Amino acid sequence: TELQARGLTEKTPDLSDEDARLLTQRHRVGKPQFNRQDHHKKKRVSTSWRKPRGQLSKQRRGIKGKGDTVEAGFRSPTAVRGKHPSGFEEVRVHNVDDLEGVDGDTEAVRIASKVGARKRERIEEEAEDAGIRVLNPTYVEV
Amino acid sequence: AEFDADVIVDARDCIMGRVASQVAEQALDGETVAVVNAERAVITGREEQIVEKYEKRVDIGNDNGYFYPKRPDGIFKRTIRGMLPHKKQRGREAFESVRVYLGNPYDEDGEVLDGTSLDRLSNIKFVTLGEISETLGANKTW
Amino acid sequence: YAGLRTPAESFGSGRGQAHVPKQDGRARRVPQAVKGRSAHPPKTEKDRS
Amino acid sequence: GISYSVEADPDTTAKAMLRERQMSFKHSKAIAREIKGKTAGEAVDYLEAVIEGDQPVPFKQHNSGVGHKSKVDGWDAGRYPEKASKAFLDLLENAVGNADHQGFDGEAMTIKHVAAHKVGEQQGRKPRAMGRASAWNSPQVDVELILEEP
RNA sequence: CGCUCUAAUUGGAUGGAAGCAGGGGCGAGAGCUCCUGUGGACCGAUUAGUGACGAAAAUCCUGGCCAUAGUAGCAGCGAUA
RNA sequence: ACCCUCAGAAGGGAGGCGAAAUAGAGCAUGAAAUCAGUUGGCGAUCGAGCGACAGGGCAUACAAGGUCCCUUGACGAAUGACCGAGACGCGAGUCUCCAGUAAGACUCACGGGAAGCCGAUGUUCUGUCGUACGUUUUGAAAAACGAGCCAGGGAGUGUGUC
Numbered sequence: 086t087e088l089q090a091r092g093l094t095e096k097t098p099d100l101s102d103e104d105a106r107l108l109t110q111r112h113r114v115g116k117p118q119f120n121r122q123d124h125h126k127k128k129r130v131s132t133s134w135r136k137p138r139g140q141l142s143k144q145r146r147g148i149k150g151k152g153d154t155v156e157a158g159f160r161s162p163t164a165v166r167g168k169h170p171s172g173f174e175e176v177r178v179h180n181v182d183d184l185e186g187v188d189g190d191t192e193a194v195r196i197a198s199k200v201g202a203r204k205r206e207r208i209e210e211e212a213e214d215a216g217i218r219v220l221n222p223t224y225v226e227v
Numbered sequence: 228a229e230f231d232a233d234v235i236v237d238a239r240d241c242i243m244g245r246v247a248s249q250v251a252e253q254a255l256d257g258e259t260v261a262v263v264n265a266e267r268a269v270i271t272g273r274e275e276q277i278v279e280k281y282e283k284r285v286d287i288g289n290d291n292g293y294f295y296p297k298r299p300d301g302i303f304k305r306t307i308r309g310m311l312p313h314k315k316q317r318g319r320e321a322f323e324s325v326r327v328y329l330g331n332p333y334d335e336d337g338e339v340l341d342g343t344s345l346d347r348l349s350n351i352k353f354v355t356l357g358e359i360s361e362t363l364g365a366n367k368t369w
Numbered sequence: 370y371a372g373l374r375t376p377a378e379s380f381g382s383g384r385g386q387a388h389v390p391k392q393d394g395r396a397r398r399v400p401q402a403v404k405g406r407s408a409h410p411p412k413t414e415k416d417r418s
Numbered sequence: 419g420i421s422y423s424v425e426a427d428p429d430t431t432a433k434a435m436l437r438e439r440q441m442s443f444k445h446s447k448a449i450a451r452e453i454k455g456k457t458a459g460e461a462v463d464y465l466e467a468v469i470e471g472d473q474p475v476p477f478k479q480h481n482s483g484v485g486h487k488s489k490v491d492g493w494d495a496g497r498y499p500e501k502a503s504k505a506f507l508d509l510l511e512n513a514v515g516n517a518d519h520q521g522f523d524g525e526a527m528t529i530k531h532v533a534a535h536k537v538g539e540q541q542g543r544k545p546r547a548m549g550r551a552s553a554w555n556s557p558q559v560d561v562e563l564i565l566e567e568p
Numbered sequence: 569c570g571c572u573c574u575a576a577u578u579g580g581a582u583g584g585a586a587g588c589a590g591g592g593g594c595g596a597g598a599g600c601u602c603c604u605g606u607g608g609a610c611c612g613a614u615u616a617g618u619g620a621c622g623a624a625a626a627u628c629c630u631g632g633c634c635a636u637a638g639u640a641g642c643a644g645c646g647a648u649a
Numbered sequence: 650a651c652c653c654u655c656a657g658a659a660g661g662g663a664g665g666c667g668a669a670a671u672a673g674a675g676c677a678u679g680a681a682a683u684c685a686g687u688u689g690g691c692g693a694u695c696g697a698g699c700g701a702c703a704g705g706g707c708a709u710a711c712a713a714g715g716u717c718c719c720u721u722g723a724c725g726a727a728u729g730a731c732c733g734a735g736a737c738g739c740g741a742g743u744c745u746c747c748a749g750u751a752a753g754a755c756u757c758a759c760g761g762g763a764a765g766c767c768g769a770u771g772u773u774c775u776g777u778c779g780u781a782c783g784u785u786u787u788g789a790a791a792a793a794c795g796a797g798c799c800a801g802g803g804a805g806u807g808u809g810u811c
């Protein structure tokens with residue numbers, strides 16, 4: 086009579102204190118949007134980042150208010166860079182054989198979208214038993 | 228029409244600019260001020276020159292306009308507005324919570340803000356807003 | 370010779386027009402013109418061995 | 419063409435549509451805007467008042483140069499577009515008709531929805547001086563109407 | 569980083585591929601990925617190649633479209649109907 | 650097909666076919682510019698590179714993010730007191746001790762709380778900064794040049810030789 090997601094939906098990974106600290110840091114510090122200059126002034130200009138190249142470019146010249154320019158100083162911490170906000174390390178999965186070798190204590194799995202409903206079912210049940218959380222679970226009615 | 232002023236200042240024999248400066252800060256601190264006896268407020272200097280400066284403000288103008296007050300009424304009020312960012316929400320709020328009056332329409336007796344008093348026994352070169360308004364051509368309603 | 374089969378000429382300055390070879394008011398030959406030549410296309414003379 | 423842009427319960431609603439009508443699209447927005455909410459009947463009596471010149475239609479958006487009309491309320495500009503009004507009468511005729519053929523009380527029904535949509539232009543050309551010709555087109559208008567039991 | 573097509577290895581799809589729309593997550597970023605809806609047949613990854621491979625600009629090209637605007641014109645001519 | 654409407658072989662309505670008519674004739678898909686209708690936010694006393702970064706209002710079905718707030722406590726970098734005591738200075742004020750103490754960003758734990766609630770997204774308000782972009786130029790917001798808007802098109806290629 087209600088919807089419920091398959092798998093270990095609530096499972097949390099177990100991280101070292103340092104990792105847990107850095108993950109937390111990442112989440113607190115965040116970063117600027119880094120959208121292409123004036124993408125908002127012209128519809129023919131996408132939000133996709135491009136280096137300001139104008140000799141006179143205000144942003145390129147680094148004027149406060151014209152937005153930040155992409156620099157290595159903005160990189161996230163090596164130790165957590167690329168983790169799901171949960172803390173897990175994502176694993177792209179296309180079939181069941183892809184679940185083999187995965188550690189559910191550290192990694193969580195994400196089933197490709199192309200994968201059909203039939204194969205997702207198998208992959209979803211086999212993943213649960215191996216104790217692996219599936220980030221994009223199927224919601225059934227129980 | 229009734230003005231629940233938290234503070235009533237007595238401008239009589241007081242240096243206009245200095246009174247204006249404090250009533251400005253207070254208004255910005257949420258205080259509701261009422262400057263009384265505006266006509267008896269005083270500005271220091273050589274009357275001839277002073278009046279020359281206020282007459283020019285009356286002569287200035289064009290189609291856009293430079294409406295400048297002649298009544299001691301207000302302004303004094305204008306003097307205060309020039310110490311307030313009256314074009315910003317907060318500024319306009321403060322300004323609109325300040326009123327200047329000819330004589331004293333209150334039962335109470337305004338207080339004399341410190342540092343704003345002119346000692347007539349030690350000064351000969353000063354003027355009265357009323358004297359200025361009269362020269363400017365205002366009808367001495369007060 | 371693809372895109373080069375036309376006598377299109379440019380009007381030059383004078384009519385608030387960009388100097389682009391036109392024919393029958395149709396721009397095109399030039400590479401930036403629809404139906405124009407390819408600027409640097411595949412070439413037979415190239416040794417692909 | 420268009421498709422009804424609003425849901426309509428078949429058991430308490432009647433629909434109607436105009437297709438590719440060559441008439442002012444600008445006048446159509448004005449009229450739609452004006453009659454929406456009224457009663458099929460009221461609407462008709464109204465459009466007739468307009469075609470007759472006794473009731474003006476407020477031109478709030480496409481009003482450049484339009485002279486003011488005293489009878490217009492809350493606004494100044496609006497006019498009396500009889501052609502578009504007539505086309506709307508044909509629409510309401512159709513609407514109320516259907517409504518009736520279904521059991522409802524055509525006239526009593528409320529104009530729940532009614533919007534005009536520029537469906538295209540019938541192109542034309544007009545010779546100009548200096549050996550040049552310019553566009554001289556006709557708007558093509560679609561319009562939807564939905565009546566609903568009061 | 570992204571694009572085309574080739575090859576070896578290896579995967580996904582009518583239990584719904586690509587695309588598109590809105591939305592969630594990751595990456596300093598190029599960009600990657602998931603969800604939902606639409607869609608109704610194709611689509612990838614890795615490695616080595618291939619190049620008619622990346623646009624905001626050129627009075628750039630073609631197509632489409634808005635404001636202009638219900639505006640100017642539908643009067644002027646010795647033929648005022 | 651049938652029926653209803655209509656001046657009507659038009660169109661419209663209802664209806665039938667098909668997995669699909671939002672497959673009904675330039676009839677697979679159906680982007681942007683853009684139009685109508687409508688929703689959220691703002692709005693008829695107020696100021697203009699349209700935003701970036703902060704922080705408040707209001708708005709939010711699910712999914713794909715799940716955090717967030719207050720007591721207290723732990724840790725506690727640079728920095729770093731009040732009060733009190735004593736002693737100087739014409740004075741504003743200062744020194745010495747208390748004391749590198751109390752305090753001190755982040756993070757964590759206990760207990761209590763939030764689900765439009767935290768993130769996020771839309772819009773709007775406040776703060777700070779801010780006169781596009783690309784080019785030409787010693788110097789561009791420029792009263793120097795280019796573009797109405799969007800989509801798609803649009804520029805280091807081949808041979809020979811060194």
Ligand SMILES: [Cl-]
Binds near residue numbers: 157160
């Ligand atoms: Cl790096």
Ligand SMILES: [Cl-]
Binds near residue numbers: 288289290294
């Ligand atoms: Cl004036």
Ligand SMILES: [Cl-]
Binds near residue numbers: 311312314315
């Ligand atoms: Cl101001």
Ligand SMILES: [Cl-]
Binds near residue numbers: 349
């Ligand atoms: Cl004196």
Ligand SMILES: [Cl-]
Binds near residue numbers: 443444536557
């Ligand atoms: Cl139109």
Ligand SMILES: [Cl-]
Binds near residue numbers: 755
């Ligand atoms: Cl930390």
Ligand SMILES: [Cl-]
Binds near residue numbers: 805
């Ligand atoms: Cl090069």
Ligand SMILES: [Mg+2]
Binds near residue numbers: 128129130131
């Ligand atoms: Mg844009």
Ligand SMILES: [Mg+2]
Binds near residue numbers: 403405406407
């Ligand atoms: Mg060609």
Ligand SMILES: [Mg+2]
Binds near residue numbers: 482483484485
């Ligand atoms: Mg007019």
Ligand SMILES: [Mg+2]
Binds near residue numbers: 549
């Ligand atoms: Mg001729």
Ligand SMILES: [Mg+2]
Binds near residue numbers: 577578614615
């Ligand atoms: Mg391989």
Ligand SMILES: [Mg+2]
Binds near residue numbers: 623625
């Ligand atoms: Mg460019």
Ligand SMILES: [Mg+2]
């Ligand atoms: Mg392109």
Ligand SMILES: [Mg+2]
């Ligand atoms: Mg063009």
Ligand SMILES: [Mg+2]
Binds near residue numbers: 639
């Ligand atoms: Mg005009």
